[PDB]
Design a protein around this ligand. Sequence first.
Ligand SMILES: [Ca+2]
Ligand SMILES: [Ca+2]
Lengths: 325, 318
Amino acid sequence: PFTYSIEATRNLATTERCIQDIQFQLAQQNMLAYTFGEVIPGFASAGINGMDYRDVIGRPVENAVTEGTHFFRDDFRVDSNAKAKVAGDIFEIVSSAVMWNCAARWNSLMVGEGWRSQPRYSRPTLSPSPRRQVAVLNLPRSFDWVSLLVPESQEVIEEFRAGLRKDGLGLPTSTPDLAVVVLPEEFQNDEMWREEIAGLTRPNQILLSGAYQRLQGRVQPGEISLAVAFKRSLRRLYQPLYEANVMQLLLEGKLGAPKVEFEVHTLAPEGTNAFVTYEAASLYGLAEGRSAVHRAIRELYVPPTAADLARRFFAFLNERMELVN
Amino acid sequence: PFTYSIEATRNLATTERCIQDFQLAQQNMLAYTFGEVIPGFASAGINGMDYRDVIGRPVENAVTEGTHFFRDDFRVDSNAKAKVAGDIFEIVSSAVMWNCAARWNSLMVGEGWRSQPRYSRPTLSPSPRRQVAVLNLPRSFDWVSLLVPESQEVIEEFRAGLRKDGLGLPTSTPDLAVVVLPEEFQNDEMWREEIAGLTRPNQILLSGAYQRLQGRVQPGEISLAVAFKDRLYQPLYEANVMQLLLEGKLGAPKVEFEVHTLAPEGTNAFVTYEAASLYGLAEGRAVHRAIRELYVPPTAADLARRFFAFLNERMELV
Ligand SMILES: [Ca+2]
Ligand SMILES: [Ca+2]
């Protein structure tokens, strides 16, 4: 469970143990199923929804360390580098699950199924419409977000990349960790995008991490609205800022997307200089010089609680999806 | 000298020593090691020497001095040696480009082509309006102050309008800038004289040359910005910022960016720096890269002949 249980750990089969004896390995798939198997932060109890998000993200590693100490005692040993990489993966996966349930509750409201009240969040004021449904896509590592686009838009990028290569120029690259896109019209009556998950069980982990495959080749460029980069400890400042401008140049510029925004989530920013740096206007918006300009990175967001993450994403959808007819 | 001399070190006053108390006095190190030697413009052995050994010579000479004068307890951290080596890497390379510009400017005003050492004579049509100045910029320097006041008013109005809507002006801080010599300075001989070495007056002359051109450079007269170096995207981003502000908002014909390094950590840096300039793609009019090259100078002579080739090609547009 979210709180460590000796009886639940004892009932775990060897394939379910959060610590895999090989040196020892942190089985993050079992860590999420053990800690968040019945708890989606922000959509659970009031104590968990209002808990410090750093303690919520750090709970699976703390539960795994307790299990390894129980079974192996002083033999159990993991490096700080291993505990850091897993915590960063959990920070991204858990936050993506919160946004997934936000989209599910949002999509339910858009199709006319009302506003779920447990837990209590402010009902969006935007007029409901099935065409305003969204999909939260946790993108794998080194994933080409161009593959999300419809074939006629991939050909524009492919011809543009080929022409630049003939002049010795490279197509600027960009790899966000997550993308929020308008739900394709052919999927606006599929109930899977409206169902909130009760916890990060193994089937639900596969559902969320693989949802990007369902939308490959089906997204219009203008339907991409938000990209997210997860840095558990933002030391490493200019790659997201550069890649945010790259996405806006290719989507808003070469593909005519109305607005493509970018934000960085972090748990411990190293100073306040990163907030000033991320106030910079989008380089493409300044280059076009015609339409209204927004920042390359809309916010350096430090989630205090999981409920604030859900509230903030609900407010984003209520304001951003108004631009969709 | 470039080669350590016990006799020369003994003649130095205590204030002229490379080791002070330990601290690496880089101004004394450059005057000791390169007081009579500008790499690429000195002996053939130094011009063709491995550039890492040339940049690493002042630190080695300073360590030798500290060893000879503080045998029992001399010690300098590897981080302190790395910081001074990085500063010497910028200053020495900036001095090479200074003498390149001086020999270039001498040719532009019709004084012929100096032949010692031998470099390929530019095929460009000489013209005093094609002279250039090499400006080593201080840390956190606002290069917009180089621009004429009318152009500064455009940037400040641009930043004020952005700040009114909660937007920040994108920042960029190159280490060095190559600009066309202002027309009021195109007959002053200081820009045509090659320095014989990095003596203390010549160090001040090169480090303070930017103050002579503040408020006097037209935006289109900026041609090349240089940065001396997991930390890969800040120069790439600031390169696009300079091109956006100069080529875009100020109408500069071409502003190129350069990153010089003595040791690239990996190989993905060269592939990453092949990216086209973001502004050039947005304008859609002859697009060039954001960073024209990730340059690893093998020798000081290669630094000189590469900068000569850039000027011969770039200054034809003027
Ligand atoms: Ca991802
Ligand atoms: Ca500098």
